[PDB]
Amino acid sequence: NNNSALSNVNSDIYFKLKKLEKEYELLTLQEDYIKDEQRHLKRELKRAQE
Amino acid sequence: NDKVRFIKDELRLLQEPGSYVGEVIKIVSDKKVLVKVQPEGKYIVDVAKDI
Amino acid sequence: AAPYAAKLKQTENDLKDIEARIKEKAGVKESDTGLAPSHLWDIMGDRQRLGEE
């Protein structure tokens, strides 16, 4: 019975998964970005109110 | 972002000039209407783009 | 109630047409104040305005 390969998963890890891993590094970068951007609208929020 | 934007948009409305308030007495034949501006005199004036 | 009710439906079409005419007409608004010999007046009139009195 059955039909599966284990060869395929391992291959997918070296090849395809590494390119997804570059993309997850970018979402890290996004994380950092929206700290500075949050602080900035906070400065502007005060300036508007004045 | 929503909050800062609104506080600035209400300020923009203040800076741009006043409004008044009339009542349409009749319709005239150039696609203008005879308004009586309630606290002042009459002015004959063009329709809007929504009216 | 046949003698008037049959034919009444026909009149209601006529009332509807009387509604349709007034709006159809009111859609078209144009001027001119005065006549053709006073169309000459404006060509002059432009000038007499730019002058102050």
PDB file of N, CA and C in Angstrom, chain B residues 15-34:
ATOM      1  N   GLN B  15      -9.512  76.783   8.158  1.00  0.00           N
ATOM      2  CA  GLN B  15      -8.623  77.741   7.452  1.00  0.00           C
ATOM      3  C   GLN B  15      -9.266  78.248   6.219  1.00  0.00           C
ATOM      4  N   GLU B  16      -9.970  77.354   5.476  1.00  0.00           N
ATOM      5  CA  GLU B  16     -10.741  77.630   4.217  1.00  0.00           C
ATOM      6  C   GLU B  16     -12.027  78.399   4.611  1.00  0.00           C
ATOM      7  N   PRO B  17     -12.622  79.252   3.812  1.00  0.00           N
ATOM      8  CA  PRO B  17     -13.525  80.348   4.328  1.00  0.00           C
ATOM      9  C   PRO B  17     -14.893  79.902   4.573  1.00  0.00           C
ATOM     10  N   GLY B  18     -15.642  80.802   5.311  1.00  0.00           N
ATOM     11  CA  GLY B  18     -16.995  80.637   5.736  1.00  0.00           C
ATOM     12  C   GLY B  18     -18.035  80.198   4.669  1.00  0.00           C
ATOM     13  N   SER B  19     -19.283  80.070   5.167  1.00  0.00           N
ATOM     14  CA  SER B  19     -20.434  79.712   4.446  1.00  0.00           C
ATOM     15  C   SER B  19     -21.536  80.599   4.975  1.00  0.00           C
ATOM     16  N   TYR B  20     -22.639  80.607   4.159  1.00  0.00           N
ATOM     17  CA  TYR B  20     -23.822  81.353   4.488  1.00  0.00           C
ATOM     18  C   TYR B  20     -24.945  80.398   4.182  1.00  0.00           C
ATOM     19  N   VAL B  21     -26.159  80.909   3.840  1.00  0.00           N
ATOM     20  CA  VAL B  21     -27.371  80.160   4.077  1.00  0.00           C
ATOM     21  C   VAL B  21     -28.503  81.015   3.558  1.00  0.00           C
ATOM     22  N   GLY B  22     -29.262  80.416   2.553  1.00  0.00           N
ATOM     23  CA  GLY B  22     -30.190  81.135   1.850  1.00  0.00           C
ATOM     24  C   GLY B  22     -31.402  80.186   1.798  1.00  0.00           C
ATOM     25  N   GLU B  23     -32.362  80.511   0.948  1.00  0.00           N
ATOM     26  CA  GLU B  23     -33.536  79.739   0.727  1.00  0.00           C
ATOM     27  C   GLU B  23     -33.930  80.053  -0.684  1.00  0.00           C
ATOM     28  N   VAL B  24     -34.242  79.115  -1.540  1.00  0.00           N
ATOM     29  CA  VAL B  24     -34.540  79.368  -2.936  1.00  0.00           C
ATOM     30  C   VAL B  24     -35.900  79.906  -3.159  1.00  0.00           C
ATOM     31  N   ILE B  25     -35.962  81.144  -3.707  1.00  0.00           N
ATOM     32  CA  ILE B  25     -37.243  81.741  -3.940  1.00  0.00           C
ATOM     33  C   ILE B  25     -37.705  81.229  -5.304  1.00  0.00           C
ATOM     34  N   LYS B  26     -36.897  81.189  -6.368  1.00  0.00           N
ATOM     35  CA  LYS B  26     -37.391  80.792  -7.687  1.00  0.00           C
ATOM     36  C   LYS B  26     -36.162  80.396  -8.539  1.00  0.00           C
ATOM     37  N   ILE B  27     -36.492  79.921  -9.803  1.00  0.00           N
ATOM     38  CA  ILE B  27     -35.575  79.274 -10.623  1.00  0.00           C
ATOM     39  C   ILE B  27     -35.637  80.291 -11.749  1.00  0.00           C
ATOM     40  N   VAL B  28     -34.406  80.557 -12.358  1.00  0.00           N
ATOM     41  CA  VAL B  28     -34.296  81.473 -13.396  1.00  0.00           C
ATOM     42  C   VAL B  28     -33.592  80.771 -14.517  1.00  0.00           C
ATOM     43  N   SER B  29     -33.667  81.454 -15.665  1.00  0.00           N
ATOM     44  CA  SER B  29     -33.533  80.836 -16.976  1.00  0.00           C
ATOM     45  C   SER B  29     -32.109  81.168 -17.504  1.00  0.00           C
ATOM     46  N   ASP B  30     -31.024  80.615 -16.732  1.00  0.00           N
ATOM     47  CA  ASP B  30     -29.641  80.662 -17.245  1.00  0.00           C
ATOM     48  C   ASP B  30     -28.978  79.477 -16.502  1.00  0.00           C
ATOM     49  N   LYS B  31     -29.761  78.815 -15.664  1.00  0.00           N
ATOM     50  CA  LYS B  31     -29.498  77.648 -14.798  1.00  0.00           C
ATOM     51  C   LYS B  31     -28.852  78.145 -13.527  1.00  0.00           C
ATOM     52  N   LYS B  32     -29.555  79.158 -12.964  1.00  0.00           N
ATOM     53  CA  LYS B  32     -29.145  79.831 -11.785  1.00  0.00           C
ATOM     54  C   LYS B  32     -30.484  79.851 -11.108  1.00  0.00           C
ATOM     55  N   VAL B  33     -30.391  80.143  -9.775  1.00  0.00           N
ATOM     56  CA  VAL B  33     -31.528  80.284  -8.997  1.00  0.00           C
ATOM     57  C   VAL B  33     -31.512  81.661  -8.259  1.00  0.00           C
ATOM     58  N   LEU B  34     -32.717  82.189  -8.002  1.00  0.00           N
ATOM     59  CA  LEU B  34     -32.882  83.448  -7.168  1.00  0.00           C
ATOM     60  C   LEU B  34     -32.852  82.928  -5.744  1.00  0.00           C
TER      61      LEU B  34
END
